[PDB]
Nucleic acid binder design. Structure first.
Ligand code: K
Ligand code: K
Ligand code: K
Ligand code: K
Ligand code: MG
Ligand code: MG
Ligand code: MG
Ligand code: MG
Ligand code: MG
Ligand code: MG
Ligand code: MG
Ligand code: MG
Ligand code: MG
Ligand code: MG
Ligand code: MG
Ligand code: MG
Ligand code: ZN
Lengths: 96, 129, 97, 87, 206, 150, 25, 217, 81, 121
RNA sequence: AGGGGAUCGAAGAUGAUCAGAUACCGUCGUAGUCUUAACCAUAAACUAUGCCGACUAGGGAUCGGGUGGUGUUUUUUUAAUGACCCACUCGGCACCUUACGAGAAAUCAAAGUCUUUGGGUUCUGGGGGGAGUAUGGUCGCAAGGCUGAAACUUAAAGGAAUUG
RNA sequence: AAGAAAAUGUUUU
């Protein structure tokens, strides 16, 4: 055999085995455990509002250079602090 | 242990054919095996076959004619509806113009064409082409 | 990958083989894996057979031999050249030289 | 293979091995066609008249071409006691 | 289909038994040679000279069916068969390859080499494995002088005979050439002993 | 094969194709049945009855000669044992192993073999209870196995 | 770092963590 | 000119063999690309890709170029050649030659009914090269070639009009994917069918019909 | 090979084959009429006897069990039934 | 080192291959004949070629060497024409006019040939 | 925890080497190594290949059993055991050749009979880390074992082979 | 028969 039951009356084992092994997928596990609601500062939402607390110069990883001018932001929704990039040439002068 | 004598017989036939032998011995040669072989022979995929009567389940010597690409069982014997026969033929057969999905129906063991023109269905037994 | 078809030893159907100690360094090696050579050296060759025979009190003494089975670990056998690294195809030659 | 109105629309109906009945593919370069000369009236090896056997590269590679040719020849004549069905 | 004239005659049967053609290999015999007559003690297996003769005549018929005599290539790398194949290619219009086979003679369509035969005859499949391999590459049928332990891979017409004996190899090549000539018409009647003497094919050590 | 081992032995009796008595056999079926009953009264199990019958007599198979199996004949004649012969011998082996084990107490291999033997006993007893050869409440107990084999 | 010695270090860390956990109450 | 070697090539030049179907029927080894040139004049070539391959040697980066070429006519005949050379143009030329030498026939058929001019494959076929397996499935009329661009180009050069493709393995290994599709195409004439069950009289080779085409006068 | 008569194997090949591997399995054992030193009966003895068969009306050992075929006590006459 | 290169070895090879009924095993006449029978573009190369030709002549005089095919192909030709003519094809003689075969060989002969002189020992 | 403790010998003591060398090397040496009565339950516990069943190449050895021989030898008194030789067979540890076939390859008689995909069945994996960690449970005297995440982090990590 | 010491080399092309 192929290491899985083939019997006409083995549907229970087949579906339970699939259920057990679906936990090894990232997205299925995240969705079924609701990680994005508990973890994930954006509590499962696409966008979030926050208050800039400090400008940061984050050194870029190798093989690059040129620190990236992010901001530390405290979200209104949950109070969690995150770091957010400020993308464009300049555009940190627009954020206070 | 042996769970499908039909699977053993068809596997033996497949191995003999793909090695190019013109004959093959299969044991223990049940009634389902004989009916499957009869469908095969009626459609010309094997030649004459002989039942050797030992006072056990028996043996069968099949004459092969090189026309057999592959014969195999479908295990388990899935229940098949009339509409599902087409899906099974599409999945198992190389083309729509030849090859046969062999079913066990209450009207007897037959190929899928005979099943369709008798308007009967049953459980899937195997295939041949 | 797997360098050797069986393994670098001779143990199929056994499971466990008692070890021996390498004569050179005392490393523990399974007896089936150890490189074993027998030494049958004449008790005095030393370019000295004729001189010992002349000194002998017996005519035609038939001087004896020393017999010693030497077991080497892989490292010591390679280092002392009892065995040599061989090409991939020559490794499969079990015949002695 | 034919279409409607029964005209051969498939090119190159291929040869089949005389021993195993499998198709001799265009790239089967171990396959071999053997002509055995027909013999009339004490020899003379009539030119252009043969019995033809096609053996597939599979049979030749498995080393069964000798026994296969023994059997086919003996069935067609050309051999009196070389091949035995029982063995 | 073969008349009683083609049937084996006692003169060449005596020739074969004297040349020791029937002395097959030891208990080591390939399980693809049913040419084994009942095996005598001391281990040597007796080759059925009748089957050897029938196979030789079939091989001769194939050779005679080849349209151009030059398109038949007779090959020997072993010394015992070099003179045999040279005399074969002399008496018949065959093309000989004695000694080294220069691999790439059937593939590798270049000058100084590259015969393109319609048939290849070898004295030993084991020692002529290179020629057999190339013939398998280019669709060339093979007749081989095969002993009970000779390989049968890509050998279409096996003539079962001793290949350990210079006498046996020379006689088998002699008989093959004689029957090819008889079929061709070079020998008008299949009753004359073919006066050309059956040691001209034998190897010459001194 | 070898339910409780890795062995793949195929050695077994190859009974003949002929289902009739051999032409050289002249004893009557009733005579063979009398011999079977005499051996049973002496206390032989069906296996050793058949062994004796084929060895010292000419009866190749009591089934082909008398038309009945030896154990069936014994049951018909009222000589059937309390437990089937194979189960009895399995229990006897289990008893012997258990005695050897309570002696010297360190034969871990004997412990393993006892596990195997009693597993075989329980499977056979389950089959016999299923076909109602044994009572449905029949239970193999190590404390009673010796007293039930003797 | 050799996996065996990483294992050793991890075991020591687990023991120390358990000790501190038990020291708390 | 050509000045052929390969008596098959001699016959083709002399006009004794006029179709490549005879070569396919007799499984004749083709060694000269001029044979294919004269027997299939309407053979178009496509360069599927050029990729650099590198051999490290003593400052290394030998940096040769490997080209994959598919030739064919959109009726029954396709060939695949892969050649590495020091320059891209040379690789392409030699690959075209190799593909022409490799030209094989494809057995086209009908998905369903028998309405003329086969549009699809006669059977399901599969071909494997490396990890890449390519499966060709007969498709109904109007389906087109459901395949990736390279396999689709190979199939239309072969002459298929309706086919489904399934693939497994590292299909981004284009060389292996094309070789697997080529093997799948070639197996179409190696699959035995009931319409090919009929026994044939085993025709005579042209090398024997015209045997006086290997000599020097 | 690739062609052989599986329904008609040669007698030599069948005799070479294992008793369970013949076309139809059957015993290779047999029964013998053995002349007991007494009289009134010729004893029937299985070739592969496991029992120390004695005469019906005497007490001489007629065969001795072995791994395979039984022995015959070195004084006896025996016919094969 | 005085190993002759391929341009000398093959030049001497061809010279000896087509000029054996020609220049002897003496270097002084060998080089003079090479002057006429070959267009060698330097005196040093001509001397090398002539010396190797002389060496090859000297070792040919003690037996043929590999890859040398001059009019040696006429002698070999004759010594290839026979080594036993009208003597004994190891046949019907060297015996009591019989064949010394074995038992199984006698059964083989009795399979078809009723007439063969056999002396099975 | 008793017994035993010759030898070797985690720790340790020591001489040397060394830039350092409470490392390799040298000399000792505790626990240990052995045993009994209990614990522990883990190893690259490996064939890194679950188990049962069928089929598909060639070959020669070898272990156990069996069969046969005008066999060799061994003596008992015709014969017979034993050992050996030859042939055959079942079962086993393996091996050699070729791979139709399989595979990414190394290689594989299974790792084959798989896109021509289904003989039965158990267990396990789903990119690399974090981590066999945290937490809970359970077992253990302990060392620990079994079960066992996530946050977060990351574009490789990895297998086989090729040329340097 | 065997033969001491030899640690290190910044980031991105
Ligand atoms: K950086
Ligand atoms: K950069
Ligand atoms: K101690
Ligand atoms: K940088
Ligand atoms: Mg390594
Ligand atoms: Mg272990
Ligand atoms: Mg079994
Ligand atoms: Mg079990
Ligand atoms: Mg110190
Ligand atoms: Mg010490
Ligand atoms: Mg301990
Ligand atoms: Mg573990
Ligand atoms: Mg493991
Ligand atoms: Mg993961
Ligand atoms: Mg690597
Ligand atoms: Mg660096
Ligand atoms: Zn060592």
């Amino acid at each position: 055999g192929k290491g899985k039951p083939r019997g006409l009356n083995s549907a229970r084992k087949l579906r339970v085995h699939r259920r057990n092994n679906r936990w090894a997928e990232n997205n299925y596990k995240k969705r079924l455990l609701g990680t994005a609601f508990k973890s994930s500062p954006f509590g499962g939402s696409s966008h979030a509002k926050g208050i800039v607390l400090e400008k940061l110069g984050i050194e870029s990883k190798q093989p690059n250079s040129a620190i990236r001018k992010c901001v530390r932001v405290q979200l209104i929704k949950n109070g969690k602090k995150v770091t957010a990039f400020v993308p464009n040439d300049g555009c940190l002068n627009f954020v206070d | 242990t042996r769970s499908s004598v039909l699977a053993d017989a068809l596997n033996a036939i497949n191995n003999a054919e793909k090695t190019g032998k013109r004959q093959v011995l299969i044991r223990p040669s049940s009634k389902v095996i004989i009916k499957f072989l009869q469908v095969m022979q009626k459609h010309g995929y094997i030649g004459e076959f002989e039942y050797i009567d030992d006072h056990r389940s028996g043996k069968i010597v099949v004459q092969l004619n090189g026309r057999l690409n592959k014969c195999g069982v479908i295990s388990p014997r899935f229940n098949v509806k009339i509409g599902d026969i087409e899906k099974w033929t599409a999945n198992l057969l190389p083309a729509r113009q030849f090859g046969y999905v062999i079913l066990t129906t209450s009207a007897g063991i037959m190929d899928h064409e005979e099943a369709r023109r008798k308007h009967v269905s049953g459980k899937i037994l195997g295939f041949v082409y | 990958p797997k360098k050797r078809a069986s393994n670098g030893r001779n143990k199929k159907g056994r499971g466990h083989v008692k070890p021996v100690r390498c004569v050179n360094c005392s490393k523990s090696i399974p007896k089936d894996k150890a490189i074993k050579r027998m030494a049958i050296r004449n008790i005095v060759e030393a370019a000295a057979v004729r001189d010992l025979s002349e000194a002998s009190v017996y005519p035609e003494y038939a001087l004896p031999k020393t017999y010693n089975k030497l077991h080497y670990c892989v490292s010591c056998a390679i280092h002392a050249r009892i065995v040599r690294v061989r090409s991939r195809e020559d490794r499969k030659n079990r015949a002695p030289p | 293979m034919e279409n409607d109105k029964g005209q051969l629309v498939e090119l190159y109906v291929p040869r089949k091995c005389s021993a195993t009945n499998r198709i001799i593919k265009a790239d089967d370069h171990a396959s071999v066609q053997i002509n055995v000369a027909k013999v009339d009236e004490e020899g003379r090896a009539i030119p252009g008249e043969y019995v033809t056997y096609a053996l597939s590269g599979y049979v030749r590679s498995r080393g069964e071409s000798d026994d296969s040719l023994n059997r086919l020849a003996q069935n067609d004549g050309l051999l009196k006691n070389v091949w035995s069905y029982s063995r | 289909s073969l008349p009683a004239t083609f049937d084996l005659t006692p003169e060449d049967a005596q020739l074969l038994l004297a040349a020791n053609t029937h002395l097959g290999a030891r208990n080591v015999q390939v399980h693809q040679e049913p040419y084994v007559f009942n095996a005598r003690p001391d281990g040597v297996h007796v080759i059925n000279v009748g089957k050897t003769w029938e196979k030789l005549v079939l091989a001769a018929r194939i050779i005679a069916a080849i349209p151009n005599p030059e398109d038949v290539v007779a090959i020997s790398s072993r010394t015992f068969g070099q003179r045999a194949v040279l005399k074969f290619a002399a008496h018949t219009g065959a093309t000989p390859i004695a000694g080294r086979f220069t691999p790439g003679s059937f593939t590798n369509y270049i000058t100084r080499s590259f015969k393109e035969p319609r048939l290849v005859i070898v004295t030993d499949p084991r020692s002529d494995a290179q020629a057999i391999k190339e013939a398998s590459y280019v669709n060339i049928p093979v007749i081989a002088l095969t002993d009970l332990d000779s390989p049968s891979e890509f050998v279409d017409v096996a003539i079962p005979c001793n290949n350990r004996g210079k006498h046996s190899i020379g006689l088998i090549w002699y008989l093959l050439a004689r029957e090819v000539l008889r079929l061709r018409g070079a020998l008008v009647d299949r009753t004359q002993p073919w006066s050309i003497m059956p040691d001209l094919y034998f190897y010459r050590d001194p | 094969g070898r339910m409780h081992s890795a062995g793949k032995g195929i050695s077994s009796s190859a009974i003949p194709y002929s289902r009739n008595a051999p032409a050289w056999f002249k004893l009557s079926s009733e005579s063979v049945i009398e011999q079977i009953v005499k051996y049973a009264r002496k206390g032989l199990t069906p296996s050793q009855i058949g062994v004796l019958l084929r060895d010292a007599h000419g009866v190749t198979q009591a089934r082909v000669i008398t038309g009945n199996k030896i154990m069936r004949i014994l049951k018909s004649n009222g000589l059937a044992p309390e437990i089937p012969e194979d189960l009895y011998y399995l229990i006897k082996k289990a008893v012997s192993v258990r005695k050897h084990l309570e002696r010297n107490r360190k034969d871990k291999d004997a412990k393993f073999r006892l596990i195997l033997i009693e597993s075989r006993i329980h499977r056979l007893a389950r089959y016999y209870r299923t076909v109602a050869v044994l009572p449905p409440n029949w239970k193999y107990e190590s404390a009673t196995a010796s007293a039930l084999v003797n | 770092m050799r996996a065996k010695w990483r294992k050793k270090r991890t075991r020591r860390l687990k023991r120390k963590r358990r000790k501190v956990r038990a020291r708390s109450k | 000119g050509w000045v052929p070697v390969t008596k098959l090539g001699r016959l083709v030049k002399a006009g004794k063999i006029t179709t490549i179907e005879e070569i396919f029927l007799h499984s004749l080894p083709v060694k000269e690309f001029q044979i294919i040139d004269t027997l299939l004049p309407g053979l178009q070539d496509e360069v599927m890709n050029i990729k650099p391959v590198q051999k490290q040697t003593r400052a290394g980066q030998r940096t040769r170029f490997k080209a994959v070429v598919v030739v064919g006519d959109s009726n029954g005949h396709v060939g695949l050649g892969i050649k590495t050379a020091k320059e891209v143009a040379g690789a392409i030329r030699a690959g075209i030659i190799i593909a022409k030498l490799s030209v094989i026939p494809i057995r086209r058929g009908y998905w369903g009914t028998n309405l003329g001019q086969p549009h699809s494959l006669a059977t399901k076929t599969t071909g494997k090269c490396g990890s890449v397996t390519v499966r060709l499935i007969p498709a109904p009329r109007g389906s087109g070639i459901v395949a990736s661009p390279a396999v689709k180009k190979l199939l239309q050069l072969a002459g298929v009009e309706d086919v489904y493709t399934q693939s497994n393995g590292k299909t981004r290994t284009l060389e292996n994917t094309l070789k697997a599709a080529f093997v799948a195409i070639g197996n179409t004439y190696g699959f035995l069918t009931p319409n090919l069950w009929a026994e044939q009289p085993l025709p005579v080779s042209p090398l024997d019909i015209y045997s006086d085409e290997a000599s020097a006068q | 090979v690739l062609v052989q008569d599986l329904l008609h194997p040669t007698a030599a090949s069948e005799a070479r084959k294992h008793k369970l591997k013949t076309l139809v399995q059957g015993p290779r054992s047999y029964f013998l009429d053995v002349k007991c030193p007494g009289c009134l009966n010729i004893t029937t003895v299985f070739s592969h006897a496991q029992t120390a068969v004695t005469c019906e009306s005497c007490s001489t050992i007629l065969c001795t069990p072995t791994g395979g075929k039984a022995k015959l006590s070195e004084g006896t006459s025996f016919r094969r039934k | 080192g005085r190993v002759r290169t391929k341009t000398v070895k093959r030049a001497s090879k061809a010279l000896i291959e087509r000029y054996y009924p020609k220049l002897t095993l003496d270097f002084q006449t060998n080089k003079r004949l090479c002057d006429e029978i070959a267009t060698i573009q330097s005196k040093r190369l001509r001397n090398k070629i002539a010396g190797y030709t002389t060496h090859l002549m000297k070792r040919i005089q003690k037996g043929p060497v590999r890859g040398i095919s001059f009019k040696l192909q006429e002698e070999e030709r004759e010594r290839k024409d026979q080594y036993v003519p009208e003597v004994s094809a190891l046949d019907l003689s060297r015996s009591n006019g019989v064949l010394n075969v074995d038992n199984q060989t006698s059964d083989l002969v009795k399979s078809l040939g009723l007439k063969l002189p056999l002396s099975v020992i």
